[PDB]
Symmetry: C2
């Protein structure tokens, strides 16, 4: 009675242990992409399950329009401190899209509250009521060129000033970007100096800098927030998701600078039935305890380096691997002729889960031996197809 | 460090037990609207917690583009059977809006697969591009059910059925018009009109379903009528997990699968094992404690209580109720809600009421006593 996403055959999963998944045929798979870069701390954590059970028995649900909860109050502070934004305000939601839309809405409202309704444009980067209707206009979404990792970071970032100049800085509300790109361009990352310059340009222009960390955050890239890898730069709004509760509960949200929060509170949103959901928040808190206790951020750095080195080593045997990239445990492989689905299918056949581009990112808790196993499975898939 | 929704006070809740909530200040509140008609089986069900914990320890997450799960396969069948749509296909998502969005996209894709891309309009009903969303007048229970529904056919002829993909409606209206329900014969006529027009009938039971209105699905109260797509949420996991979804008739499912063979690619947590496990546990309880039957009994008691109050407060222009989904039309509601909260009663010119289906007879009387006090304060 399941409405499958497509007519293809869907294996039925029955168990998840660590970095592995098992189906109802006994087949075992190494979760090379943590599902969709979601299962950051691995599968089968009884610790998280116990925490969710305790919250369900104590206080499972309250609607945010009526009550806050002790677990949300606790988690908000814990999360803010972990990511290095101790004074920021946490807006909890159930998914990444809700979190992203909340961020955009907030950026727009911020300027309207300050008496600057002319600021409505939201700049985004390739390849990633009456007060809000301007966001519906095509002109509200100007595009910044794709970053060029081979160019001096600050110089590359200056492209933002150029765009602002032609758009008219007084018409711009914000600039939103994934510090390290996800699926759109597998693990593409700007050169050093890029975000430091972006932060400064945004401050000069008076626009809100939104960091989309839905995929790159929570230790994934070897740092609490990937943006911090660039001289500790901090955004005005950080968007979180997927890895927040690491697959244990539908949890996402954003962290807003005090200035932004206070502006909107003076003079935010209504729906979201499960926004701030106690059981889901408890899952996030338990996951955070683990991320910190096991120093998975540090683990992502070490294991990420090992996996990247392995992918680079494979290029000699498979020169069809046009480019290999990685920041922490968010890596990418660009393929070409001297398909990503063809190699993905072959990988699955061999028991390797993956996301012309291949996005890789196993659980931050993966062991060194398991990283080598992942590489061996990938080599087999490449051999089958190439 | 919490980003509150507004500058007003948001008491910090710390415990939920049965139909009661308690804050860190010691205060107790009677959850008269189950939050937002979400907590259908009451608060603090350790049973559900244990089921979620067991799932988290066994298989917490798989992405639907890669794997299905044994718990989802189990739940899909159990849910389908419980709601009276045993052969329907379950599409799981994490929230009501995702479910409704999915239903509309499915209805539109259905016609595209059949070579009728012109059918793009989705008819909805007041007050639940503009031209793509025709509006049917709100129901009039004072009018004959079939007579009232006939307006849908007239609207179809006005719009041109060849340009319509579906008709979506809440069997019993929610907050838009507190518990407004059509007269007998309404949906029976709707079903026939849709069949004749060849359009998809979508029943939005996100608030009205899962026993809320004294039936597995509220639509069934109208001669067992079944939709082509039933949208569910809220009461699904009853506040224990963000879970929602839709059940599609085999005809609809097979048409998409037999055509392009693909539906949707978004929704990271769609089919989420832990949330689905909560839904399965909630379903076990709903069936075991016959909460659908309870809603009918407790609902009749609460409605009678509201009608008695109406005799005292003529400002209560209308008092309505279907199972435990009730409404009070005033001729104001906001002030009553504020006065009620001060007295310890949680509420949703309309007042929507709907306590947990597990509420006891004594607790219904307690709810009525608190409401009476709030009414006296304002009226």
């Amino acid at each position: 009675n399941v409405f499958y996403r497509s007519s293809k055959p869907y294996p039925v999963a029955v168990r998840g242990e660590g970095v592995f998944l098992y189906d109802d045929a006994g087949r075992r798979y190494l979760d090379g992409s943590s599902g969709a870069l979601v299962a950051n701390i691995g599968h089968g954590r009884a610790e998280v399950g116990e925490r969710m059970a305790a919250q369900a028995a104590r206080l499972p649900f309250v609607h945010g329009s009526q009550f806050s909860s002790d677990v949300l109050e606790e988690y908000a502070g814990r999360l803010a401190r972990f990511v290095g934004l101790p004074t920021f305000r946490f807006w909890a939601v159930s998914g990444g899209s809700e979190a992203t839309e909340s961020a955009v809405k907030l950026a727009r409202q911020y300027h309207v509250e300050r008496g600057e309704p002319g600021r409505f444009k939201v700049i985004t980067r390739v390849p990633s009521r009456e007060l809000y209707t301007p966001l519906m206009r095509p002109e509200a979404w100007p595009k910044l060129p794709k970053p060029d990792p081979a160019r001096n970071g600050a110089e590359d970032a200056e492209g933002l000033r150029a765009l602002l100049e032609r758009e008219g800085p007084e018409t711009v509300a914000a600039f939103m970007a994934e510090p390290v790109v996800g699926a759109s361009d597998a693990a593409l990352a700007p050169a050093p100096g890029y975000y430091e310059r972006v932060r400064d340009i945004c401050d000069e222009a008076g626009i809100i800098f939104i960091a989309d960390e839905v995929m790159s955050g929570m230790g994934r890239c070897g740092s609490p927030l990937a943006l911090s890898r660039w001289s500790g730069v901090t955004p005005d709004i950080a968007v979180l998701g997927k890895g927040l509760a690491a697959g244990y509960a539908p949890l996402a949200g954003l962290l807003a600078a005090p200035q932004v929060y206070e502006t909107v509170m003076g003079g935010f949103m209504h729906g979201f039935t499960y926004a701030g959901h106690p059981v889901s928040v408890a899952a996030g808190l338990s996951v955070l305890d683990i991320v910190e206790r096991e120093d998975l951020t540090g683990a992502a750095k070490e294991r990420g380096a090992q996996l990247l080195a392995g992918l680079q080593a494979l290029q000699a045997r498979f020169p069809q691997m046009m480019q290999v990239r990685g920041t922490g445990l968010l890596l990418g492989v660009v393929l070409g002729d001297l398909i990503a689905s063809r190699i993905g299918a072959a990988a699955l056949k061999r028991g390797l889960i993956t996301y012309d581009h291949l996005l890789l990112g196993p659980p931050l808790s993966i062991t060194a031996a398991e990283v080598d196993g992942l590489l061996a499975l990938l080599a087999g898939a490449l051999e089958d197809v190439l």
